[PDB]
Amino acid sequence: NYGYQPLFEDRRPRNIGDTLTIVLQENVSASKSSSANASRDGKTSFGFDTVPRYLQGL
């Protein structure tokens, strides 16, 4: 090979045949949450158990 080569550079790959080292160190994490609620409660009462003579009509 007659190609020029720098002395002080970091010897990065530059041509087709050059080799490079890859450190994967891949780490991905995704999360998703959702919630919903709805509560309705009702309860009504009414009773005499004793009615006046004048109110017995109703």
């Binding site: 080569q5 720098p6 002395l7 002080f8 550079e9 970091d10 010897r11």
Partner: protein, 61 residues
């Protein structure tokens, strides 16, 4: 310096002291003259980059 040594054929281990005081990292600036020819030569200015005390009798490589 380690890159230059590796290019020349010497591979220093990554973990080493390498505490030298006879070298200094420098930036070299030059004025590309008009109509510059391939074989011609020009003057350059070398300025220290790090904490070097002096460049009295140094050699640019």
């Amino acid at each position: 310096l380690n890159n230059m040594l590796s290019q020349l054929g010497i591979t220093v281990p990554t973990g080493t002291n390498m505490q030298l005081k006879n070298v200094a990292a420098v930036m070299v600036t030059a004025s590309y003259p008009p109509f510059a020819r391939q074989g011609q030569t020009i003057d350059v200015v070398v300025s220290s980059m790090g904490n070097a005390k002096s460049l009295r009798g140094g050699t640019l490589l």
